[PDB]
Design a protein around this ligand. Structure first.
Ligand SMILES: *[C@@H]1O[C@H](CO)[C@@H](O[C@@H]2O[C@H](CO)[C@@H](O)[C@H](O)[C@H]2NC(C)=O)[C@H](O)[C@H]1NC(C)=O
Ligand SMILES: *[C@@H]1O[C@H](CO)[C@@H](O[C@@H]2O[C@H](CO)[C@@H](O)[C@H](O)[C@H]2NC(C)=O)[C@H](O)[C@H]1NC(C)=O
Ligand SMILES: *[C@@H]1O[C@H](CO)[C@@H](O[C@@H]2O[C@H](CO)[C@@H](O)[C@H](O)[C@H]2NC(C)=O)[C@H](O)[C@H]1NC(C)=O
Ligand SMILES: *[C@@H]1O[C@H](CO)[C@@H](O[C@@H]2O[C@H](CO)[C@@H](O)[C@H](O)[C@H]2NC(C)=O)[C@H](O)[C@H]1NC(C)=O
Ligand SMILES: *[C@@H]1O[C@H](CO)[C@@H](O[C@@H]2O[C@H](CO)[C@@H](O)[C@H](O)[C@H]2NC(C)=O)[C@H](O)[C@H]1NC(C)=O
Ligand SMILES: *[C@@H]1O[C@H](CO)[C@@H](O)[C@H](O)[C@H]1NC(C)=O
Ligand SMILES: *[C@@H]1O[C@H](CO)[C@@H](O)[C@H](O)[C@H]1NC(C)=O
Ligand SMILES: *[C@@H]1O[C@H](CO)[C@@H](O)[C@H](O)[C@H]1NC(C)=O
Ligand SMILES: *[C@@H]1O[C@H](CO)[C@@H](O)[C@H](O)[C@H]1NC(C)=O
Lengths: 49, 50, 198, 99, 50
């Protein structure tokens, strides 16, 4: 409530407070099951363009 | 697609050419997980109803 | 004059739609204000010929049937005193800023989109409400909107209205000519004050 | 303000996002014309109505309350005396009966 | 159409004539008036971040 109101003294009543309580500690990455590498050797190292 | 939130299992059904879901069009709610073809809907981590 | 007006509408139309819905709500509020001021009693009473008002001369506020307009003399002075758009802004605007009842489409072009909506109640219908209120008041008094207006002499209505302020009817009936003369003199001083261009 | 006619009561009722008033009002009907007078000159003095108005049916004068026709015999209790009848404009000649 | 100003009727005025009712009706009318509207609020963390 103090951080929402930007003051160290709050008055009597109800106050709607923005979220400060939760911070993510882990990250997950989900990609498709792809194994082979892209043929950039064919695209970039071709004999004739 | 990167973000911060919480996921739940969703009963939505996706067409085969659809990957993301946006009922409000400024927040991606439903997504199709790439490895397992289940559809997971994403709600924000922020419980602001306090 | 944009070439991509449809794309501009698709990206910024709901913002102006909300702002125009705010302005339309304000205009509807103005119409409700006019209705709640003038249309409290929705009964139209014809203006009686001037006949035995107890010496009270109402010809300056009670409108004449000879004029094509429904307005009265005092009302005519009130509308003549406030000229519409008689201000410095008239030179640039061309009177497009206010309702002259003749404003044309050219004014919207000058104001970049802004238009002036005419009021729902025409000044003729406001003058008719005012004349109906005056005729019903003078003829009946309190029984006007009670339904079934009940005719009563104006002297007896004045006696009842002195009973309203705790003064017996004998004060009126002994001094009726003096009260009528004072009322006519006050009406004349109001007319002359409105005619003095102050 | 609270219904057409003379207000008597108003009953509130709750309503979705609002309130509905049931106004019970008195609406007069079956009106009658009467020849009325401001005062009555009897015995050289003017009699004014304490309550109501002086009306006449045929050639007989009564005093009635304004919102309902209840003819009552003109009485010294019903009237009060102030001055002479030479100054009142529209005064009529009648008798004021005493109990 | 044109807006109706009211019921057209006439009253006969005279200096020695009055109109007194001889009967009455007790009439109940309903007047509906809004009192409150829907209380709404915005949550800042879900609105800004999602
Ligand atoms: C009420 O007063 C008005 C003036 O304010 C009277 O109108 C005048 O009528 C007389 C003739 O009787 C004319 O000489 C005046 O020039 C009129 N003045 C105007 C401006 O109209 C009106 O007659 C009075 N009504 C009554 C019946 O007493
Ligand atoms: C009360 O004041 C009024 C004026 O406000 C007086 O009325 C005047 O009476 C005199 C004499 O009767 C007349 O000459 C005037 O013409 C009257 N003027 C008006 C406006 O009509 C009245 O007489 C005063 N009464 C007392 C007892 O003082
Ligand atoms: C006006 O109404 C009054 C009250 O009804 C009449 O007074 C009575 O009338 C009846 C019937 O004519 C007589 O029998 C009574 O003797 C009358 N009593 C009184 C108070 O005099 C009155 O006659 C009516 N007047 C007219 C001419 O219509
Ligand atoms: C009321 O009655 C009185 C008499 O009691 C009338 O007064 C007389 O009227 C006649 C005719 O006008 C005159 O010749 C007398 O000189 C008057 N005498 C008095 C006492 O002044 C009076 O006119 C009647 N009024 C009404 C309204 O009819
Ligand atoms: C006033 O009007 C009411 C109705 O508004 C009359 O009441 C009626 O009275 C008659 C005779 O007693 C009955 O047959 C009806 O059933 C009543 N109707 C109602 C609405 O209750 C009342 O009599 C009228 N009074 C006068 C003097 O006309
Ligand atoms: C590209 O081709 C040349 C020619 O054979 C070869 O020497 C080089 O190693 C190649 N590079 C890659 C990244 O494959
Ligand atoms: C992706 O590969 C892993 C490793 O073999 C396997 O466990 C998983 O089931 C695979 N997911 C599929 C095929 O959807
Ligand atoms: C009262 O008199 C006027 C005109 O004389 C008439 O139009 C009206 O109908 C009368 N009303 C009654 C109830 O007699
Ligand atoms: C009512 O007006 C008539 C016609 O002008 C007149 O004869 C009569 O004396 C007036 N009565 C009153 C009380 O003013």
């Amino acid at each position: 409530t103090k951080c929402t109101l930007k003051s160290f003294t709050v008055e009597k009543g109800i106050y709607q407070t923005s979220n400060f309580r939760v911070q993510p500690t882990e990250s997950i990455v989900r990609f498709p099951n792809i194994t082979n590498l892209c043929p950039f050797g064919e695209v970039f190292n071709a004999t004739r363009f | 697609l990167t973000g911060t939130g919480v996921l739940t299992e969703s009963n939505k059904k996706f067409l085969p050419f659809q990957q993301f879901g946006r009922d409000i069009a400024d927040t991606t709610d439903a997504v199709r997980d790439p490895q397992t073809l289940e559809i997971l809907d994403i709600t924000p981590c922020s419980f602001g109803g306090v | 004059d944009s070439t991509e007006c449809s794309n501009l509408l698709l990206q910024y139309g709901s913002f102006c739609t909300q702002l125009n819905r705010a302005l339309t709500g304000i205009a509807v509020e103005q119409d409700k204000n006019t209705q709640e001021v003038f249309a409290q009693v929705k009964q139209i009473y014809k203006t009686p010929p001037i006949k035995d008002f107890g010496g009270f001369n109402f010809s300056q506020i009670l409108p004449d049937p000879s004029k094509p307009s429904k307005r009265s003399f005092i009302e005519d002075l009130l509308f003549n005193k406030v000229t519409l758009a008689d201000a410095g802004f008239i030179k640039q605007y061309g009177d497009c800023l206010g309702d002259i009842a003749a404003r044309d489409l050219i004014c919207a072009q000058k104001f970049n989109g802004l238009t002036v909506l005419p009021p729902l109640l025409t000044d003729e219908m406001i003058a008719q409400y005012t004349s109906a209120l005056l005729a019903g008041t003078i003829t009946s008094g309190w029984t006007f909107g009670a339904g079934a207006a009940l005719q009563i002499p104006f002297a007896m209505q004045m006696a009842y209205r002195f009973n309203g302020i705790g003064v017996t009817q004998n004060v009126l009936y002994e001094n009726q000519k003096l009260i009528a003369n004072q009322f006519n003199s006050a009406i004349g001083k109001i007319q002359d004050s409105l005619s003095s261009t102050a | 303000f609270c219904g057409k006619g003379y207000h008597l009561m108003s009953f509130p009722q709750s309503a979705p996002h609002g309130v509905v008033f049931l106004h019970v009002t008195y609406v007069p009907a079956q009106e009658k014309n009467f020849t009325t007078a401001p005062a009555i000159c009897h015995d050289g003095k003017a009699h004014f109505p304490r309550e109501g108005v002086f009306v006449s049916n045929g050639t007989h004068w009564f005093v009635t309350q304004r919102n309902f026709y209840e003819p009552q015999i003109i009485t010294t209790d019903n009237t009060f005396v102030s001055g002479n009848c030479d100054v009142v404009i529209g005064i009529v000649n009648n008798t004021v009966y005493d109990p | 159409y044109t807006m109706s100003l009211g019921a057209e009727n006439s009253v006969a005025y005279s200096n020695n004539s009055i109109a007194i009712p001889t009967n009455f009706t007790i009439s109940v009318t309903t007047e509906i008036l809004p009192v409150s509207m829907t209380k709404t609020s915005v949550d800042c963390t879900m609105y800004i971040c999602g």
